[PDB]
From Swiss-Prot, chains A, C, D:
It is found in: Cell inner membrane. Disulfide bonds: none annotated. Part of the ESX-5 specialized secretion system, which is responsible for the secretion of EsxN and a number of PE_PGRS and PPE proteins, including PPE41. The chain holds residues 51 to 100 of 1391 of the full protein. It comes from the Bacteria. This is ESX-5 secretion system protein EccC5. The chain crosses the membrane at residues 15-35. Part of the eccB5-eccC5 operon, which is essential for in vitro growth. Disruption phenotype: Mutants are defective in the secretion of EsxN, PPE41 and PE_PGRS proteins. Part of the ESX-5 / type VII secretion system (T7SS), which is composed of cytosolic and membrane components. The ESX-5 membrane complex is composed of EccB5, EccC5, EccD5 and EccE5. The gene is eccC5.
Curated annotation (Swiss-Prot), chains B, E:
The chain holds residues 10 to 83 of 506 of the full protein. This is ESX-5 secretion system ATPase EccB5. Part of the eccB5-eccC5 operon, which is essential for in vitro growth. It comes from Mycobacterium tuberculosis (strain ATCC 25618 / H37Rv). Residues 1-46 are cytoplasmic. It is found in: Cell inner membrane.
């Protein structure tokens, strides 16, 4: 969030409108990675083995 | 009987149903249930890869529009 | 990388020093998550051993 | 960061490129010192399990 | 005597004494030693936190002085 804010404060205004699609998708991609749950050496139970 | 209506559900039941759906789908086209190899999974995934590649190129085109636009006349 | 490159074409050049610290450190966080994803080990199966 | 910001207000502007490599790398060492404190155990007794 | 004088000491003897001090201190005010929770510890730490928060703001003010002193007029 700081990067988008830094660019706006600097006066670029490049991300206004459709340009905003980049930060939005990144935030979604970040959410997906940290939400996969536990997959370990003891926590072996997963779709490929069940 | 049991199971009717819009009751609650869990994540283990959702995968359980997808397993029966794939296995019965195989029985209609191959008439056998051994499933040592599961080709339905693979054939579906190939389409998902295709769609992903089309969208990735799609984002690549939008990125160049801002880097080197057509409006730079004069 | 795409989000970063688009700002330079606008000429704002807000990065460097004060600005670069955000993308530089943020990049490390993504790598740090993929490492925990390939979690576990010691299985030791491989073509040369079989 | 305060030590860093204090130099820019003085106008020396010695940071960026060559100079910035010091505080950038220095930051990792502090973070590395805290994570070593993380090795206190590998177990959970969270409210969801109790 | 056994413990008189000014001889050397070790790390385990330092915590050992501070434990006897905490247990006997609450015995003077609450008249019981069960010590389910040890509130003496928390009330003390709350003061330490207060002093630390004051030092942080105080130190924060000195940082502001260098970013914008009074002599930079016009």
């Amino acid at each position: 969030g700081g990067m988008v804010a830094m660019v706006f404060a600097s006066g670029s205004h490049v991300f206004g409108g459709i340009g905003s699609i980049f930060p939005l998708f990144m935030m979604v991609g970040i959410m997906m990675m940290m939400f996969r749950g536990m997959g370990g050496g003891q926590q072996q139970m997963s779709r490929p083995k069940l | 009987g049991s199971g009717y209506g819009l009751g609650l559900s869990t994540r283990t039941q959702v995968t359980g149903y997808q397993f029966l759906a794939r296995r019965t789908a195989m029985a209609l086209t191959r008439w056998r249930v051994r499933m040592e190899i599961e080709p339905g999974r693979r054939q579906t995934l190939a389409v998902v890869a295709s769609v992903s590649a089309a969208l990735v190129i799609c984002l690549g085109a939008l990125l160049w529009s801002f880097i080197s636009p057509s409006g730079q006349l004069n």
